[PDB]
């Protein structure tokens, strides 16, 4: 799972999966981007792999 930081817990289903759908622009670390689209420009959220 992931920890998500939101620019203005965060619902990660709003981030489109790879080839998926969503309502928020998300970017993240390498693990996040392996499963989710990573769209850095005007990103609403940054998500990184949760250690532990």
């Amino acid at each position, epitope marked *: 799972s992931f920890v998500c930081f939101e620019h203005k817990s965060f619902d990660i289903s709003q981030c489109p999966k790879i080839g*998926g*759908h969503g*309502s*928020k622009k998300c970017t993240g670390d390498a693990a996040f981007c392996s499963a989710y*689209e*990573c769209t850095a*420009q005007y990103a609403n959220a940054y998500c990184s792999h949760a250690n532990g």
Partner: antibody
Framework: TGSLEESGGRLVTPGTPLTLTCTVS????????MSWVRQAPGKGLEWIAI?????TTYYASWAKGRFTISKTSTTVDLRIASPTTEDTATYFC???????????WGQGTLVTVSG | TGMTQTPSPVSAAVGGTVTINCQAS????????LSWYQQKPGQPPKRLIY???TLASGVSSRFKGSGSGTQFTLTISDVQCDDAATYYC?????????????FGGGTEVVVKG
């Protein structure tokens, strides 16, 4: 700051392959999912294909096998492999419709297929 | 697989309220990933609404979207002559199982001045 501009629309005979180009300005290379959409004169909007930031592509069920969507750092291209008179339309490119950023559309490029 | 909108024309007197309906045979992805568009002749469509009910930047508060799952409505209040146009819903679906994106057939608004 962002805008889109379609080019490559022209009159061709049926079966003449045709590539259309969407030139992107002010938008980062892998930060949106770009679609092509068309509209025949007097008819509704028809979604054709999408290319995600990841490079993943989908096509409308009717479009599969007849159209190819591709991208570079500054363009999104649509190849129409074997046009028919039914493909006569204005072709638009558009950004991903569910994001909260401005949904950008170009002015469109006009394709005419005729003998 | 089928997206049906209100048949054209919808006739709206100036100052009145109009509703346009969009119905999907399947639920849209995550139930609210549905957007609405206005198209005037000679122009590309302009997005009015996304996430079923969120107003896009620049758009008049006279436009409202509601609904979820398979049933959605665009309401135009205090209808003006400038609202004469064709309005389209756009649904999102799993691209592996259906069309990734699908437009309804469009609904023309004729304004009675």
């Amino acid at each position: 700051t962002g805008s889109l501009e379609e080019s490559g629309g022209r009159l061709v005979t049926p079966g003449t392959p045709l590539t259309l180009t969407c030139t992107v300005s002010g938008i980062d290379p892998n930060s949106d999912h770009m679609s092509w959409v068309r509209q025949a004169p007097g008819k509704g909007l028809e979604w054709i294909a999408i290319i995600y930031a990841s490079g993943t592509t989908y096509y409308a069920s009717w479009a599969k096998g007849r159209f190819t969507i591709s991208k570079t750092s500054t363009t999104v291209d649509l190849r129409i492999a074997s046009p028919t008179t039914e493909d006569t339309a204005t072709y638009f490119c558009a950004t991903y419709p569910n994001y909260p950023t401005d949904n950008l559309w170009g002015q469109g490029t006009l394709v005419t297929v005729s003998g | 697989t089928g997206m049906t909108q209100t048949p054209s024309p919808v006739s709206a007197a100036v100052g009145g309220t109009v509703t346009i309906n969009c119905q999907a045979s399947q639920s849209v992805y995550n139930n609210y990933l549905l957007s609405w568009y206005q198209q005037k002749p000679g122009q590309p469509p302009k997005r009015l609404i996304y996430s079923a009910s969120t107003l896009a930047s620049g758009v008049s508060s006279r436009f409202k979207g509601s609904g979820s799952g398979t049933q959605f409505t665009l309401t135009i209040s205090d209808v003006q002559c400038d609202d004469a146009a064709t309005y389209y819903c756009l649904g999102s679906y799993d691209g592996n199982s259906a069309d990734c994106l699908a437009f309804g057939g469009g609904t023309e608004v004729v304004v009675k001045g």
